Structure 1
Amino acid sequence: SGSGMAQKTWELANNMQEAQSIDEIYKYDKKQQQEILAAKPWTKDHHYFKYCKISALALLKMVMHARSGGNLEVMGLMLGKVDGETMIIMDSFALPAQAAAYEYMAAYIENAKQVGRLENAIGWYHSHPGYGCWLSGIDVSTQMLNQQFQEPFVAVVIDPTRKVNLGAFRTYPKGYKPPDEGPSEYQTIPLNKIEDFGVHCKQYYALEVSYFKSSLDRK
């Protein structure tokens, strides 16, 4: 008796509680992010960030944008958040210009908020078509200014021509000297680029890149 109505009430309760849970998770993520941003542990430890988790969706969009440029470098902005020593990249958008970059950034955050996901500006990406993942002279100077003004901010470099050719980097501040050596993995770079590479290779380091697939990103 009233078994049918009970089942519909049960389904309604599950749906109403799921909606409340998503809202509480969003609000908890927001406060947590605001707290991490107030503490700024990265301003004291120059090697604080060590990991970079990239969604398949952000990767798909970045590779498509990088491929579309051909032999020309392209760039865009990335959305995500901080989780300890890990920089999370959840989404990205192609560029194109400053006001336009501001208005898209605001639109992507609102769109994610509607589906209960917290994200903000986390970095920039650009392509090195046919010459590997590293920071050039202009990239090192741009990323140093970013780690003073746009902080927390990561520099992603993609080489769409050749395996998973993506690098995530963090510069060292002016005057700071890191300890010992760090050539990491091998990368073949053209001879006409090797000097610019060498002149700036100790002014930054690489984050440990990993990839993830979100439930919302299963599209």
Structure 2
Amino acid sequence: AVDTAEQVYISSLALLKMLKHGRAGVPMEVMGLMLGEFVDDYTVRVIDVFAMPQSGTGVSVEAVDPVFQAKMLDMLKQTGRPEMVVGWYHSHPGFGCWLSGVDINTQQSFEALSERAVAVVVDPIQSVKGKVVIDAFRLINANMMVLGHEPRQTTSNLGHLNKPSIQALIHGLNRHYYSITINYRKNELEQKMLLNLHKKSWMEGLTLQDYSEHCKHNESVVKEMLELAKNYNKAVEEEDKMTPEQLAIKNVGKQDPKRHLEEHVDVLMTSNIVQCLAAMLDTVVFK
């Protein structure tokens, strides 16, 4: 049995594969194959993912061609290194994550091959930065649901750490499948070479930024900053008046000079000081 402490390790590349292939054909439920070393009864380490092209038009999951994955399984065999298929996936696009009745069928065709195969759902819309949203699953036997017996025998405070979503709770949630807590494997060998390369200027701050239009833009802020300051000479004067909660609800139709003012003060400030200092270093450095 299991102890709901399964702890799937994955990768640092397969997430990128899942979002790219899940994003390119996004309104159709695209799919593909998962490929990694199957370690012990608890954990699994799926290092690689290759996708599969579709069968035809239609929002579903199509089928699997063992000619195609037989060949593609051997391309890396005679080129890179052998691995083992462990799981598979599909893509609920903007749905969240659960198992449909079509999903549970093609899962059921795979668990008979290997009893510890893995269902995976990617959701490449509702992810923004810290919410990637995958929540890998696997079937539970409805036979034990007929038995009225509770599976999966918790021996570790590791399972009930993430609360399930209400939509998957509406779906087969706890009557046909279970969730698996996952995490990621990474190293400084990757961390440095993605951090040091993503957003990098080159020699751009060692320029002068449109030297006629710098002072012209400075004029082009101060000019309306005058009348905005006149509105600041308008908006203070209705204090010693009605309560500031009415001075909170009442200000949702017309602009305030306060926040809009301190925005432009910052923009003029950091706009000027960078051009000043960067203008003055080149006098020393260049002759």
Question: How is 1:143-182 mapped onto 2 (pairs within 5 angstroms)?
Answer: 143-162=107-126, 163-177=131-145, 179=150
Deviation at 1:166, TM superposition (A): 0.6
1:81 is aligned, of 10, 33, 37, to 37
TM-score scaled by structure 1? Answer: 0.64
Report the equivalent of 2:230: none
Are 2:175 and 1:211 aligned? no
Question: How is 1:1-219 mapped onto 2 (pairs within 5 angstroms)?
Answer: 45=1, 50-84=6-40, 85-96=42-53, 97-113=65-81, 119-162=83-126, 163-177=131-145, 179=150, 184-187=162-165, 189=167, 197-198=171-172, 201-213=174-186
Deviation at 1:174, TM superposition (A): 4.5
Gaps of 5+ in 2: 54-64, 153-159, 194-287
Q: Following the alignment from structure 1 to structure 2, what is the Cα–Cα distance between the partners of residues 102 and 68?
A: 25
Alignment RMSD, CA only? 3.1
1:109/1:201 CA distance change after superposition, 3 Å: farther
Q: Following the alignment from structure 2 to structure 1, what is the Cα–Cα distance between the partners of residues 83 and 14?
A: 13
1:171/1:99 CA distance change after superposition, 3 Å: same
Which deviations, in whole Å up to 9, do the C-alpha atoms of 1:34-89 show, x marking residues without a partner?
xxxxxxxxxxx255771211101111111101111221110000111222211111
- Structure 1 or 2, whichever has the larger Rg, is 2
The answer to whether the 8 Å contact 1:132/1:188 transfers is: no
Deviation at 1:214, TM superposition (A): 6.0
TM-score scaled by structure 2? Answer: 0.50
1:47/1:104 CA distance change after superposition, 3 Å: farther
Q: If each structure's strand is expressed as a fraction of its own residues, which one has the higher value?
A: 1
Residues 173-182 or 94-103, more deviating: 173-182
SS in 1 for 2:120: strand
